[PDB]
Amino acid sequence: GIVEQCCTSICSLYQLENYCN
Amino acid sequence: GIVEQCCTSICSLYQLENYCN
Amino acid sequence: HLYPGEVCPGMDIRNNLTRLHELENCSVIEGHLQILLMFKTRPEDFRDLSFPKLIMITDYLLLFRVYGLESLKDLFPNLTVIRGSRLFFNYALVIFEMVHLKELGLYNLMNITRGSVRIEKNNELCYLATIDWSRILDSVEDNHIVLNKDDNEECGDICPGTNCPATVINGQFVERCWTHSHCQKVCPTICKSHGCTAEGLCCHSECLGNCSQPDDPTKCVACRNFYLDGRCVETCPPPYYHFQDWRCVNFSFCQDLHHKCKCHQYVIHNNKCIPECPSGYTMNSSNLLCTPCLGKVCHLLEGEKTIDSVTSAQELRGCTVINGSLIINIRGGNNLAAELEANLGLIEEISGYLKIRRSYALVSLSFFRKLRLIRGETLEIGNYSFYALDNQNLRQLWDWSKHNLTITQGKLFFHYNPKLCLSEIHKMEEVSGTKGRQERNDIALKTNGDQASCENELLKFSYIRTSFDKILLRWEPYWPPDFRDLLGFMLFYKEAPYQNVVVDIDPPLRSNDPKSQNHPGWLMRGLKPWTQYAIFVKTLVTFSDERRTYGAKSDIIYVQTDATNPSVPLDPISVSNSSSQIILKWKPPSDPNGNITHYLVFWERQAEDSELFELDYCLKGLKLPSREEHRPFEKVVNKESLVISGLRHFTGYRIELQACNQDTPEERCSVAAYVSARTMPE
Amino acid sequence: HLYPGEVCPGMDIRNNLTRLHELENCSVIEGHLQILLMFKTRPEDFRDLSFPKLIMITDYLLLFRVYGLESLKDLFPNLTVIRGSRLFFNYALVIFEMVHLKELGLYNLMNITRGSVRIEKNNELCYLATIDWSRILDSVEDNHIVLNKDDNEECGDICPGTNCPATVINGQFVERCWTHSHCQKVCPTICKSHGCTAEGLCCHSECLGNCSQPDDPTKCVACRNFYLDGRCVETCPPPYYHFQDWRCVNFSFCQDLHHKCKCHQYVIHNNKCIPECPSGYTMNSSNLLCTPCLGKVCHLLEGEKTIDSVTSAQELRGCTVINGSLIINIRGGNNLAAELEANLGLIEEISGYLKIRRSYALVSLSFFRKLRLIRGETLEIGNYSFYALDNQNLRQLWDWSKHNLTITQGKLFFHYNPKLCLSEIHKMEEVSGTKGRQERNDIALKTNGDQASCENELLKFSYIRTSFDKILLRWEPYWPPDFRDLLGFMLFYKEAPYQNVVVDIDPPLRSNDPKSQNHPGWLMRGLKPWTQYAIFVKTLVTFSDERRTYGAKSDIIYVQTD
Amino acid sequence: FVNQHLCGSHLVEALYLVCGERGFFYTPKA
Amino acid sequence: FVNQHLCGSHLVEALYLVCGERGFFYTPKA
Amino acid sequence: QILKELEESSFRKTFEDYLHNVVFVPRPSR
Amino acid sequence: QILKELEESSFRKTFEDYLHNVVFVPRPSR
Ligand SMILES: *[C@@H]1O[C@H](CO)[C@@H](O[C@@H]2O[C@H](CO)[C@@H](O[C@@H]3O[C@H](CO)[C@@H](O)[C@H](O)[C@@H]3O)[C@H](O)[C@H]2NC(C)=O)[C@H](O)[C@H]1NC(C)=O
Ligand SMILES: *[C@@H]1O[C@H](CO)[C@@H](O[C@@H]2O[C@H](CO)[C@@H](O[C@@H]3O[C@H](CO)[C@@H](O)[C@H](O)[C@@H]3O)[C@H](O)[C@H]2NC(C)=O)[C@H](O)[C@H]1NC(C)=O
Ligand SMILES: *[C@@H]1O[C@H](CO[C@@H]2O[C@@H](C)[C@@H](O)[C@@H](O)[C@@H]2O)[C@@H](O[C@@H]2O[C@H](CO)[C@@H](O)[C@H](O)[C@H]2NC(C)=O)[C@H](O)[C@H]1NC(C)=O
Ligand SMILES: *[C@@H]1O[C@H](CO[C@@H]2O[C@@H](C)[C@@H](O)[C@@H](O)[C@@H]2O)[C@@H](O[C@@H]2O[C@H](CO)[C@@H](O)[C@H](O)[C@H]2NC(C)=O)[C@H](O)[C@H]1NC(C)=O
Ligand SMILES: *[C@@H]1O[C@H](CO[C@@H]2O[C@@H](C)[C@@H](O)[C@@H](O)[C@@H]2O)[C@@H](O[C@@H]2O[C@H](CO)[C@@H](O)[C@H](O)[C@H]2NC(C)=O)[C@H](O)[C@H]1NC(C)=O
Ligand SMILES: *[C@@H]1O[C@H](CO[C@@H]2O[C@@H](C)[C@@H](O)[C@@H](O)[C@@H]2O)[C@@H](O[C@@H]2O[C@H](CO)[C@@H](O)[C@H](O)[C@H]2NC(C)=O)[C@H](O)[C@H]1NC(C)=O
Ligand SMILES: *[C@@H]1O[C@H](CO)[C@@H](O[C@@H]2O[C@H](CO)[C@@H](O)[C@H](O)[C@H]2NC(C)=O)[C@H](O)[C@H]1NC(C)=O
Ligand SMILES: *[C@@H]1O[C@H](CO)[C@@H](O[C@@H]2O[C@H](CO)[C@@H](O)[C@H](O)[C@H]2NC(C)=O)[C@H](O)[C@H]1NC(C)=O
Ligand SMILES: *[C@@H]1O[C@H](CO[C@@H]2O[C@@H](C)[C@@H](O)[C@@H](O)[C@@H]2O)[C@@H](O)[C@H](O)[C@H]1NC(C)=O
Ligand SMILES: *[C@@H]1O[C@H](CO[C@@H]2O[C@@H](C)[C@@H](O)[C@@H](O)[C@@H]2O)[C@@H](O)[C@H](O)[C@H]1NC(C)=O
Ligand SMILES: *[C@@H]1O[C@H](CO)[C@@H](O)[C@H](O)[C@H]1NC(C)=O
Ligand SMILES: *[C@@H]1O[C@H](CO)[C@@H](O)[C@H](O)[C@H]1NC(C)=O
């Protein structure tokens, strides 16, 4: 989930790259 | 013990009879 | 007619206004609409952009972080009705984080059926206090509005004059409008159900909100319940079927809807095109009818679901078997319990565990209607089939009269439950039959139910002594089976003109009970006369780590006070409107001190002053001023005035006035108030 | 001379005055004396009854529920000293539930060395305010007096005139006496230790309290430390040995004492006749000397002992190995900690678990000096080797600089420890090496250490602006890893004439940190000029069930205005 | 015969009523 | 690149900086 | 006393979370 | 605030208990 990745953990740019198309 | 028998349980007269000589 | 456009089921629009032209013609969108995340838009991108065709949305509507937009009067001038089948944290209108959005112009919105409206983080929006939500919504206390331009009071959200209804709500008249131009329309107090027309006449019994002609099903604007071919209808005649609570469709329609998942394949029941059949039912190869048969498993995703609102709740609407575990967490502030009940546990079983964590306003669990069995085939960590934490309003679990509970495995976990006393806890242990499982600290024995004395022991008063300034109570001295544990007596008192509902007392010497002459008591001095008081007593005892002797509390009792000599009869005004008539008027005294029986009136004939009889008025200096014993008396009953007759012209009168709160034995009466007067000359 | 009677060690008397004549002649009773449970006694049963022969009791003395007795100046006119080796809940004088007991007349009592005095449930007793305990005891704050005739203020406990010293203590001159006749004797401020004689001259350096002649070891009344044959002595000359901290005996005496358990068989060490040797020692068949050797298992009764006072403590005085479990439960009210340290765990091992339940005044555990290992071979139920509950003053466990801890099995159990913050708890988990055992709610994460801000984070003030009417403080805005959790700033302010040591501020907008122009401030108006103020700030944040971001507190700063 | 949990002077007078005569000695070793 | 736990408008602007162009569609089924 | 406001702020935060969770995964489908 | 008095009363009770425990078993030896 969103805070499960960016607030529980810290998101990477590669993790957010799947949230680019 | 004392409250272990007379307050935790309730003492009987036979139990207190050992506390007669 | 009534709906020239089409359905065009709900698709949500992002990043630019390009896909917005896909949703132009259609008059009532099935589903919902979200508009979100357009950072590269302009205010000029909306001036050439309007959709008057939309009138009603079924489920909800959302606006989220789109730049350049300032209003909605152009994009949706004519949206009118929100049904709200699929809700959104019990909302249906999302106005959120919208930069530059300063106004709405949503005058044509008339009734939102189910749901609420949340407005947040919109630092340009105003014209909001001019919006009566009670005309549009029922539960207006579920509308959260914060972090807006109105929160820093700057907007003059005014209209030029009369038009806009200035209705009193809380302190004064609230002018109701949408823009500086658009007033907020108010239908009268009889056309409220179906709306009103322009002059204010009531519409047809199937219209809703607006109608083009008063009392015409063929000339409404929005249907109340159902639509059928230029007529809003109360029900579907045969062979038509209620589809999604808004229309009547034929058999071939919902028939061929099934043939497209080859996703929500559909069946028929109760003259309704529905998604699925509940338990004990079967499909039909002929007509897809929910036929009864012998013997509904809602298997979860990962056997687990966090449940927080109606949006969570309707996913398990109508389920009978839950093949998983449930988690109840609602950081709330509003009781959704009826709507919670409306789509919940018509079930018996939970295959896994049950969790209840940190929910605030859940006072009870009675919305679990048919809930019987806990399988607990997957346990909560710590080997529990049940969880409970941080429930500030939870008092009752169930009445164990007819509600039952069967728990297969697992244990109980009770912590931080300040309105949940141990009595029903051990009753749940009993009815569960799983009492031979729970270890120490499976129940927090210091936090659970520590805001009110609950359990069993009741004080009983032996004697009551009353006065106008003294109170003594006497009651049976209770002693716990360890008599040393009694620390003292907690007493709560107050006055109470209604009946819709602090000191401490040292315990006496126990020392025997053939004649335990130790009936405890307390004297109160602080009494008001004739005054009703409400008193109850609680027993302060020592906590023990074991099954502690639960301690006693008394009944709330009501004892009224007596009375005494009333105060000074205020403002004696003694006017003589005639030559023998004297009106004496007065105010009630400051302290009636009981129900006032009457007013004791004394008028006394004061003779002329005796020094005037031996003075030579023929000499210059002739300045004349133009001015036990039973005295004549009166008991003025139920009147603050008295005219007195049979009086002398040119005679000054002393008047002694008292009030009286007791008349028949030994009159308790006020102290003397005095005035003097003179009758008119003849 | 100095003690013409005998020892006659302590036996306690019940149900009638018949066995009392066993204890007539004896000068100083070794051990203790209790008199208890005599309902059918009469006031006439005491006028023909007196014992001036007793002067000192070693350990303690107890009076419990004997009727008809009203005074004590006849039964013991000349009891003078209580040493107090074996104590009784840190008391050596028990006067309790004594019907008709109205006065004492215990004027010859001068010093009570170790222990205290507790008085309760004696609704006849008076002359109580006329007793300076500081002349007789040291820790006068450990004396419990309640439920008496003095507690319903009736007794005029006076004396006819001067004699009795009227000394200011708390509010005014307090007349000091025992009866209406017997004054309370006060030695001067130089004869304080060894006592004084009648005219006020100092006694000998080995006397104590009373002396028949001033400055004479052969004409004392009571020895300070040790007695030998008409002389109060500072130590034992050879070939003599200290016995029970009061005398010198030869090898023959303590030798023949051993020959009678064939119960406290004795040995000799450090010129002393002692009961037993500590660990690493060995007896001697010749002279019973604690000889050193290579390699003391105080094996409990059922492996378990509730420990509550010194009376519990001296049973384990000087032990090294505990083959059992300990329960620490002291509903106290007074710090026993020094004397608690004086006879406790010079040990390293505990075979079973350890329990600490509901103890109040225990601020620390530094009295545990040498403890290293817990075997935990018998656990607390619920699989614990360790227990902790309801400790209203406990802050520090140990300094983990030199203190160590080794834990074999079992778990930790932490609840309702309101000044025990989680930092040292996690340090204990670390030094224990048993961090991979504790489940959820083995630590109460709501009640442990919730009375003072502890953990780590410190606010640092960027800017200070003062006036005679204005105060502004600017500090570095801390932000937790979830910036939403910061809800406000708790500030505590007050004035401070010494330096021996309330408002709220909303959080400003974070929104970035290249240039977070959000240095937060509060303006104070309520200033007095020339006045020293003590101000400090706490950060109000959101609780979370996880490892919560501990939050920050500022330093107590002192600002003097114009 | 009371059937109740007992402490204090209640328990004391109960024990004296049970004992009457001698009731209790004090020889643990002698 | 920040190395920090992120929520709210911080996370929103971070996601917009990551996406730039299109970034996210809305076709779960269609 | 005012702890309902304390949980109300967390309610606001949860409302923030859920919309973000809606916005988060319609895009990764691969 | 005054909970030290609350535990002090229990301390008094414990002091009551211990003397009673001393009085209790010197007698049963059989
Ligand atoms: C907006 O229009 C509706 C149309 O009647 C007004 O009435 C509300 O109608 C709904 C639908 O019939 C009612 O809900 C129903 O409640 C029953 C239990 O009472 C439940 O069993 C049904 O399943 C359904 O949920 C609702 O009670 C009713 N409310 C009132 C106050 O009559 C509605 O009042 C209109 N809004 C305004 C602001 O006037
Ligand atoms: C009553 O008489 C004694 C006799 O000297 C007075 O002094 C006290 O003597 C005891 C016995 O030696 C001292 O206790 C010792 O304390 C040390 C630690 O300091 C400890 O290691 C020893 O094992 C022993 O327990 C005590 O400190 C000492 N007190 C003073 C103030 O000198 C005592 O003062 C006399 N009482 C009164 C009220 O005058
Ligand atoms: C919105 O409606 C216009 C008007 O056409 C009507 O709606 C169409 C869906 C179709 O049913 C027509 O017969 C109706 O009269 C649509 O414009 C027409 O689009 C079609 C192709 O989509 C084209 O062949 C026609 O020439 C267009 N006619 C006109 C007058 O422009 C438009 O496409 C509809 N948009 C949407 C999103 O439905
Ligand atoms: C059974 O119903 C279907 C579908 O109903 C249509 O759609 C509804 C939403 C509503 O708009 C109805 O008024 C519609 O009729 C019928 O199929 C349509 O029939 C109309 C006849 O007026 C025709 O113009 C449409 O083209 C048809 N739809 C398609 C996709 O071809 C059907 O005729 C009905 N059958 C009977 C016996 O009533
Ligand atoms: C208290 O002392 C008297 C006096 O006798 C002294 O003490 C004796 C124990 C013994 O050592 C004598 O030599 C001393 O002079 C005791 O009275 C004597 O009792 C014994 C019986 O044991 C008897 O044979 C003597 O005749 C008694 N002598 C006198 C002078 O009365 C008395 O018993 C002592 N009390 C106790 C409890 O020991
Ligand atoms: C070794 O000591 C014993 C015992 O000492 C006696 O008791 C002490 C408490 C103290 O009072 C000493 O003065 C005592 O001597 C001696 O045995 C006793 O000796 C005395 C001598 O006066 C005699 O009257 C006793 O009867 C003896 N006791 C017995 C039971 O017979 C012993 O003499 C001492 N030996 C040496 C060499 O000093
Ligand atoms: C909770 O209870 C279950 C039941 O005994 C424990 O699970 C067992 O664990 C052992 C070994 O770890 C397995 O061999 C069994 O098959 C397990 N049984 C089941 C039903 O799962 C579990 O260890 C307990 N957990 C705690 C924390 O007490
Ligand atoms: C505490 O842990 C011990 C150790 O696993 C458990 O005791 C075991 O119990 C089983 C069956 O009951 C026995 O076969 C083992 O021999 C026991 N081991 C020991 C060391 O005693 C005990 O069940 C646990 N208790 C709780 C409450 O979890
Ligand atoms: C659940 O409870 C229903 C009502 O209980 C009935 O009334 C109470 C007072 C009890 O006496 C109970 O035994 C009665 O039956 C029952 O109709 C139903 O059978 C119960 N179900 C189970 C599984 O116990
Ligand atoms: C017990 O602790 C003693 C002191 O520890 C010393 O100082 C600390 C800072 C550590 O660095 C520690 O390693 C040092 O030894 C030791 O003398 C003693 O060996 C310790 N015993 C055990 C069993 O750890
Ligand atoms: C005194 O008590 C003891 C034991 O209690 C008994 O042996 C003796 O007979 C009693 N004597 C008298 C006179 O009561
Ligand atoms: C609008 O957005 C869609 C989807 O991201 C994209 O295909 C299209 O090119 C965009 N058009 C413009 C003008 O940005």
* Domain limits, chain D: 13-175, 250-292, 304-437, 457-560
Q: Contact, D360 vs D328, CB < 8 A?
A: no
B4 near H CB under 8 A: no
Q: Considering only the beta carbons, identify the residue of B11, B16, B21 that sits closest to E22.
A: B21
| Closest atom of ligand 5 relative to the D23 alpha carbon | 37
Q: What is the DSSP letter of C63?
A: E
- H11 and D331 within 8 Å at the Cβ level: the answer is yes
- What residues of chain G lie within 8 A of the CB of A2, using their CB? 17, 20-21, 23-24
Q: For the structural domain made of D457-560, what CATH number should be given?
A: 2.60.40.10
3-state helix, strand, coil in chain A (%, to 5): 50, 0, 50
Q: Which residue of H14, H19, H23, H25 to mutate against D (max D Cβ within 10 Å)?
A: H19
D93-96/D60-66 β-pairing: parallel
Q: Which residue of G12, G17, G25 to mutate against C (max C Cβ within 10 Å)?
A: G12
Into which CATH architecture does domain D13-175 fall? Alpha-Beta Horseshoe (3.80)
C39 Cα to the center of ligand 11, angstroms: 105
- E25 and B21 within 8 Å at the Cβ level: the answer is yes
Both tokens of C174, joined, read 């609230």
* Residues in contact with ligand 2 (CB, 6 Å cut-off): D 111, 113, 136-138, 192-193, 208, 224
CATH 3.80.20.20 is the classification of domain D304-437: yes
Residue nearest to atom 15 of ligand 3 (CA): C25
User: In b/e form, how buried is each residue of D15-29, taking b as 16+ CB within 10 angstroms?
Assistant: beeeeeeebeebebb
Tracing tokens 């007819």 back to the chain, one arrives at C402
- B3 and H30 within 8 Å at the Cβ level: the answer is no
- H6 and C484 within 8 Å at the Cβ level: the answer is no
Q: What are the residues facing D464 on neighbouring strands?
A: D473
Both tokens of F5, joined, read 């736990």
Which backbone phi and psi does D170 adopt, to 5 degrees? -115, -55
Angle at which helices H3-24 and E8-19 pack, to 10 degrees? Answer: 10
- G16 and F27 within 8 Å at the Cβ level: the answer is no
- Closest residue, chain H, to E24 (C-alpha): H27
Q: Distance between CA C642 and CA C599 in Å, rounded?
A: 10
- Domain coverage including residue H13: 1-25
Both tokens of C511, joined, read 């020392």
3-state helix, strand, coil in chain G (%, to 5): 75, 0, 25
Question: Radius of gyration (Cα) for chain B, nearest Å?
Answer: 8
Q: What is the DSSP letter of D238?
A: T
What is the SS3 assignment for C86-126?
Answer: CCCCCCCEEEECCCCCCCCCCCCCCEECCCCEEEEEECCCC
- Resolution attained, angstroms: 4.7
Q: What is the DSSP letter of A17?
A: H
Neighbouring chains to C with at least 3 Cβ pairs closer than 8 Å: D, E, F, G, H
Vertex C8 angle, CA C4 and C11, to 5°: 145
D552-553/D457-458 β-pairing: parallel
Ligand nearest to the CA of C53: 3
D61 Cα to the center of ligand 5, angstroms: 26
- F7 and D482 within 8 Å at the Cβ level: the answer is yes
Both tokens of D408, joined, read 């074999």
Q: Contact, D54 vs D28, CB < 8 A?
A: yes
Tell me the shortest Cα–Cα distance from C413 to chain D, in angstroms.
11
> In the structure, do chain C and chain A come into contact, i.e. share 3 or more CB pairs under 8 Å?
no
Interface of F with C in 1-30 (CB under 8 A): 9, 12, 16, 22-26, 29
- E6 and B10 within 8 Å at the Cβ level: the answer is yes
Q: Distance between CA C549 and CA E4 in Å, rounded?
A: 14
- F24 and C39 within 8 Å at the Cβ level: the answer is no
* Best CA proximity match to D58, nearest among D10, D2, D108: D10
C43 CB contacts (<8 Å, ≥6 apart)?
A: C68, C69, C70, C100
On whether residue H18 sits in a domain, the answer given is yes
Q: Distance between CA C669 and CA C593 in Å, rounded?
A: 10
C423 in helix, strand or coil? helix
Asked if the domains C457-559 and C573-678 are classified in one and the same CATH topology, the answer is yes
On whether residue H20 sits in a domain, the answer given is yes
C457-458/C552-553 β-pairing: parallel
Which backbone phi and psi does C566 adopt, to 5 degrees? -60, 165
Q: Distance between CA C17 and CA D357 in Å, rounded?
A: 69
Tracing tokens 């005044």 back to the chain, one arrives at D361
Sign of CA dihedral D82, D85, D91, D95: negative
Q: Considering only the beta carbons, identify the residue of C36, C333, C392 that sits closest to G8.
A: C333
D371 Cα to the center of ligand 10, angstroms: 13
Q: Distance between CA C379 and CA C325 in Å, rounded?
A: 9
- H21 and B19 within 8 Å at the Cβ level: the answer is no
Q: Which residue of F22, F26, F29 to mutate against G (max G Cβ within 10 Å)?
A: F26
Vertex F24 angle, CA F19 and F30, to 5°: 170
On whether residue H30 sits in a domain, the answer given is no
Q: Distance between CA C602 and CA C635 in Å, rounded?
A: 9
Q: Distance between CA E18 and CA H27 in Å, rounded?
A: 13
- What CATH superfamily is the domain C1-186? Receptor L-domain (3.80.20.20)
Q: Contact, C387 vs C364, CB < 8 A?
A: no
- What residues of chain H lie within 8 A of the CB of D331, using their CB? 7, 10-11, 14
> In the structure, do chain D and chain H come into contact, i.e. share 3 or more CB pairs under 8 Å?
yes
Peptide bond into C418 cis (omega under 30): no
Number of Cβ within 10 Å of residue C101's Cβ equals 24
Q: Considering only the beta carbons, identify the residue of B2, B18, B20 that sits closest to H21.
A: B2
Residue nearest to atom 8 of ligand 1 (CA): C113
- G26 and F27 within 8 Å at the Cβ level: the answer is yes
| Determination technique for this entry | cryo-EM
Angle at which helices G3-24 and F8-19 pack, to 10 degrees? Answer: 10
- D97 and E24 within 8 Å at the Cβ level: the answer is no
D24 Cα to the center of ligand 6, angstroms: 22
Q: Distance between CA C348 and CA D215 in Å, rounded?
A: 95
Q: What is the DSSP letter of C331?
A: -
- What residues of chain D lie within 8 A of the CB of G10, using their CB? 542
Amino acid at E30: A
User: In b/e form, how buried is each residue of C259-269, taking b as 16+ CB within 10 angstroms?
Assistant: eeeeeeebbbb
Peptide bond into C278 cis (omega under 30): no
Size of interface D-G (CB pairs under 8 A): 7
Q: For the structural domain made of C573-678, what CATH number should be given?
A: 2.60.40.10
Into which CATH architecture does domain D250-292 fall? Ribbon (2.10)
On whether residue H15 sits in a domain, the answer given is yes
Amino acid at D470: K
DSSP result, C476-489 = -----SSGGGEEEE
* Best CA proximity match to C356, nearest among C376, C319, C386: C386
CATH pick for C457-559 out of 3.40.640.10, 2.60.40.10, 3.30.750.24, 3.40.50.1110: 2.60.40.10
Both tokens of F19, joined, read 């996406």
C514 CB contacts (<8 Å, ≥6 apart)?
A: none
Q: Which residue of H15, H19, H24 to mutate against B (max B Cβ within 10 Å)?
A: H24
Residues of chain C with a CB closer than 8 angstroms to some CB in chain H: 484, 487, 542
* Best CA proximity match to D434, nearest among D457, D415, D413, D406: D406
Tell me the shortest Cα–Cα distance from C457 to chain E, in angstroms.
18
CATH 3.30.420.40 is the classification of domain C300-432: no
Tell me which of C380, C383, C437, C438 to substitute to probe ligand 7's pocket, judged by most ligand atoms within 8 Å of the beta carbon: C383
Residues of chain B with a CB closer than 8 angstroms to some CB in chain E: 2-3, 6-8, 10-11, 13, 16-17, 19-21
- What residues of chain D lie within 8 A of the CB of G13, using their CB? 484
Interface of H with E in 2-21 (CB under 8 A): 13, 16-17, 20
Tell me the shortest Cα–Cα distance from C546 to chain F, in angstroms.
46
Tracing tokens 């529990």 back to the chain, one arrives at C384
- What residues of chain B lie within 8 A of the CB of E1, using their CB? 13
C305 CB contacts (<8 Å, ≥6 apart)?
A: C312, C315, C316, C324, C326, C327
Tell me the shortest Cα–Cα distance from C525 to chain D, in angstroms.
25
